From a paper:
Tpms are coiled coil dimers that form co-polymers with actin such that the Tpm polymers run along both sides of the actin filament. The stability of the Tpm polymer is dependent on the 4-helix overlap junction between adjacent dimers. The importance of this junction is highlighted by the fact that the greatest peptide divergence between Tpm isoforms lies in the N- and C-termini which generate the overlap junction. Anti-[name].1 compounds (ATMs) are designed to bind to the C-terminus of the [name].1 coiled coil and have activity against [name].1 function in vitro and in vivo.
Numbering used by the authors:
A (entry chain B): 12 to 78
B (entry chain A): 6 to 74
Write the structure that this text describes.
Amino acid sequence: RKIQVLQQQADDAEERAERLQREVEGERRAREQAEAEVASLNRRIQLVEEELDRAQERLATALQKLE
Amino acid sequence: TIEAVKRKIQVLQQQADDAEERAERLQREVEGERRAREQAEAEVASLNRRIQLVEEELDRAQERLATAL
């Protein structure tokens, strides 16, 4: 009957560890989602910077055609 | 029967100790993944501010182009 107190203690400890193991997997999923957004924004900023370079290069041809 | 109770108690206490040590390792594992997540989230916020900056530089370039024509 003292064993049932110890058996419950071991049950609770194993349960907290399993609860934390699922916490690891949930944090890893959220990490991968944020890192996937980082990749998407990296691709998006490169495209607008390319659009800007062309917009300034076009501006240069128009200004250069002015002198 | 006497030793079987002293041994059942020992095996149950070793089980809880191993589980408690596993929990400490997993707590650091959680933090390792969270640290990496919040690093990415900070870069997301930075990339959103930079994209808005480039879009403003773009609008200034397109506006002057329309004028320069």
